[PDB]
Write a protein that binds this ligand. Sequence first.
Ligand SMILES: *[C@H]1O[C@H](CO)[C@@H](O[C@H]2O[C@H](CO)[C@@H](O[C@H]3O[C@H](CO)[C@@H](O)[C@H](O)[C@@H]3O)[C@H](O)[C@H]2NC(C)=O)[C@H](O)[C@H]1NC(C)=O
Length: 361
Amino acid sequence: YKLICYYTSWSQYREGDGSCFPDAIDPFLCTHVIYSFANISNNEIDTWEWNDVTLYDTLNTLKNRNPKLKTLLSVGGWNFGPERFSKIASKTQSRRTFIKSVPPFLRTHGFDGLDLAWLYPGRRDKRHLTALVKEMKAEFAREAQAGTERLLLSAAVSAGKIAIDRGYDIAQISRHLDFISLLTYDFHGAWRQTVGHHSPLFRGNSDASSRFSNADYAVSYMLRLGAPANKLVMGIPTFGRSFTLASSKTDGGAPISGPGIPGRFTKEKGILAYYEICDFLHGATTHRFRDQQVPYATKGNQWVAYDDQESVKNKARYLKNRQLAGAMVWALDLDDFRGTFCGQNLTFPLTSAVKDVLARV
Ligand SMILES: *[C@H]1O[C@H](CO)[C@@H](O[C@H]2O[C@H](CO)[C@@H](O[C@H]3O[C@H](CO)[C@@H](O)[C@H](O)[C@@H]3O)[C@H](O)[C@H]2NC(C)=O)[C@H](O)[C@H]1NC(C)=O
């Protein structure tokens, strides 16, 4: 079983214990660690943070302790304009340029592969996305002729049915990618004013429309569209989503006035690190959707949708029963990496939970 874990560059600037460097990663925790977000300049892959070269090296030294540990660098991300991506892949001239620039880069800094994080291609992009993948794999296959281990090529893909139909040719790209990460944790849409869970496992016998907004459907749809189970990786969130209640109503469907207040270390409205959530829980009321098998908490006018050890284990069991390749965890820096916030002196409680399920078979 694979266990793909993302590490984000910007988590280093977090104050106090929130600060996280590659240093804190247990080399034996995951099978692959993806460094989050390289950038693109003059149609060529490039660094983002001033000290990326130092961090790249810090991350890749973990491989000295765990010889089997694979690392990848990811291009794109949320702060990377989809248009910029769209622009690079349409013109075969800039595409080939971008492509040829990658292997040397990755080889210089010690990466075993590239992760494509084109955050949401549109209807006019499908054709070009396919081209990018086809050609990149071809270039990688070629570079291996030089006597070295072929570079890996993966991609983070949307879990929403509409987004999927619109910009992805799943059948095509699947035969060229090494593994696909399903972003099964962006289900509750930031568009409108209601309380809801962003990473439900099941549909839940309790609301007819938007049966497409749960991991179960997402996985079944990908399999239907032709992606091999042995290449699909289900994404599991290590963070939670917060909301500011617009009323004293706390149950499903309650009115929302806006995102929840930021966390001490995370500092972003509407998001909270799992370790921030462990602190929040004190004096909070815990609930759990039985149909969807995920929890949520409320305190004052703040409403939080998150994942605990049990929900995460549940998702992992599901993942194993459908016979998927593994799990993907978004942000090791959002889990309790120090292991000092969430009671149990355990390090990486959430990621460890997934690993336990993947490991007992
Ligand atoms: C990776 O990706 C981008 C593309 O290379 C980097 O970017 C910007 O690139 C330069 C750097 O500041 C900007 O500014 C010059 O030109 C603009 C007009 O384009 C002038 O107005 C400005 O005064 C500068 O002379 C570009 O505007 C901007 N380009 C794009 C496409 O966004 C980007 O910096 C990088 N990594 C990071 C750290 O974000």
